[PDB]
Amino acid sequence: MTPNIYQQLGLKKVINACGKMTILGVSSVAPEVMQATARAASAFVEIDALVEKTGELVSRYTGAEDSYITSCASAGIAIAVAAAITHGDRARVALMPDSSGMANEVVMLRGHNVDYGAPVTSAIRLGGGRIVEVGSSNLATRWQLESAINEKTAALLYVKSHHCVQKGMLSIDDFVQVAQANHLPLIVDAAAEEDLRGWVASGADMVIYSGAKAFNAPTSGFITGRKTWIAACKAQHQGIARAMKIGKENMVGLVYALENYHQGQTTVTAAQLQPVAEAISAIHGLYADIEQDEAGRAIWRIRVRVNASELGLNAQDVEAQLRGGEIAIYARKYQLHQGVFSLDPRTVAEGEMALIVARLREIAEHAAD
Amino acid sequence: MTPNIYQQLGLKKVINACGKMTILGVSSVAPEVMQATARAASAFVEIDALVEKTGELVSRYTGAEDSYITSCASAGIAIAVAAAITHGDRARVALMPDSSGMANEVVMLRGHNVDYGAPVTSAIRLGGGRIVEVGSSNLATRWQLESAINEKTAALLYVKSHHCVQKGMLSIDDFVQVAQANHLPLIVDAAAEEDLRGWVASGADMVIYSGAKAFNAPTSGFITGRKTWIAACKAQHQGIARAMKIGKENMVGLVYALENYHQGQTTVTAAQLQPVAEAISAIHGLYADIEQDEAGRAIWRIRVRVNASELGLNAQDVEAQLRGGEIAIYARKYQLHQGVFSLDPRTVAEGEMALIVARLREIAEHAAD
């Protein structure tokens, strides 16, 4: 392959087969999307008019009243909290994140206090919020959520993620009901979610997505929800949002990435994966098969099982040599203890499949057995 | 002209003749720079290796030990303060911006407390800093700077800007001497500055630039300085810097924009401006002449003076109709009270000069006199 730009700077060529991981650059933007960004970058625009129009265009995909584009989902969380605390008041916006003497408590489940590389507490604290944790890490009841609300509460936060505790937690419906009964905004963190309308439709006031993670967009994120609260988010441009800046180029890039996602994307069919699966199985000690997501639909992956006796290496040794090689090959390390590594083709580009098989055989030949 | 992407979204075509203004998108990235960004966006990379290499490449232009790329200059200020307060300690990084019980005072001149669309206080406060203002708005002595230092002081901040009070303030040398005498880091805000080496060479520990403003780069900024303090800046990726994210694409874009700036750029010569100046003077009531910067070198601009009696409109009426027209034309509004507006050709692209002259005549014809 012709060397990528990172190879030209002295870095390794990376093959992504794990997923949208922040340690590898999150996502690969489509070339059609980068064209729209470059044309936007090479021209001036009235930013105030761009903010409204991009919010209007993004809202067409989410079904909310208005939308606001941010630099990332973490910035969306900080802005959404600041919106709930300041109500858009220009004086309070300049004070953030020193919310002294204001209603600044953000109520969330303890099971949702998650670390995605950085603690979700940091994003909330940047917006001026003070975290109030509800329930235990394994169980949370509704009366615990209702008792946590008092005159200092500024917002409720619901976090949707596989990082969160999956059982024993309250439903999104419980948060909506408690929030509207106390006349408080409900904020939803759906950073990796691809469902654009489901979280807004549930009655949440502000929902936060990450444009890079889910929709393979240039570095971006957006808040979508009620126009009154989105307006309070926009007011943060004179405050904390000035440090979380996204330019006109990536604002446009997100919009075209949403349209590129809405038009549809041709996912890799199972028929295409089988030739790659057969080649890996030919290697001594490696057995490869195509597997749909055991708990998910419309996702095909190549599961590879390693026999230490035949190959001479365990699955941990294979995965490490895949990354450590001259071409950094990142596979899924979930079931590595069980002797299995898997390949997610969604982040794999054309031809990259063949290179992974070549490295697998080279690792086998270097066993020398 | 073929409609730009913003025109396709329903927005006005903008002609920039004022300068790098945040209300118009700051800057126009060079097409060669956008190519490097698109290739970077369409590929994965080990971010940890990219952070070091980009810091090394940026440091070649500034002469500092190391460098760190940020989303904007405001993010660089927040990170630099957090670096001075946390010293890179992972526990303190997670606490920001709640720097309770730490040395968190940032000492700066009151004459440097400026508003660039957002108060510089907001960026400092996001990093955990508490502002300590030195001197008055018109005068600041050295003993005032030395008396402000105590065991709670975390850093000294020097702000370079035309927004700052120009006379009566302390020199950069005074800040360096006081900072090193108390063993405290000196932070310099040089967001719009094009001098990459002068501020680092003066002995400042961390200097902050804006990649978009000065070097016509995609949305970016960087901190450059001593490796020990830059290391404390990098440590903020697990804390407040997670919300001020810049992706791999604009990280590369800044590096290629610095090389595109270092190779040199062909500035518009005075000979090229004269045809445009002559056409404007042909209009009744308008007198146009080329003028070098009265206080600056190597900057040519087209100063246009309006005669209300002849034209029928004052300079304020002309400037407003330039912006309000179907093509938004932004001129310099500094001496508009004196009956003069000027045209800065640095942000004007090829052919855009001719369109401005056409609108000027249309405004004159619509006088109907």
Add this chain to the structure above:
Amino acid sequence: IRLGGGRIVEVGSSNLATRWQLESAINEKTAALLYVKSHHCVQKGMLSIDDFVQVAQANHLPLIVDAAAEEDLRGWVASGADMVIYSGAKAFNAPTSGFITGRKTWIAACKAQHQGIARAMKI
């Protein structure tokens, strides 16, 4: 200001000050608004004397104007300021002196200071 018992509340930045910033600084602890006319002050980007008069009269608070070097005796009183301060030596080549001029109700409160802090500022 501190000799008179005041605690300073600063509005805006050194280069820019908006009206909503001026109005937000007013609260139940506010005792007066102060406008300073001088070449020492920042010229561009600051609020006009009219903005201070309107905000002061909207909160029933006294507006104080420092016009020490000003030779305009009537212009600052005419704008509606409650107390305007001049320096007799600076502008009118007088022996060491100064004066406060303004509304009779507030000048009376100034005269009342002769039993207090004004005993140390004797003319």
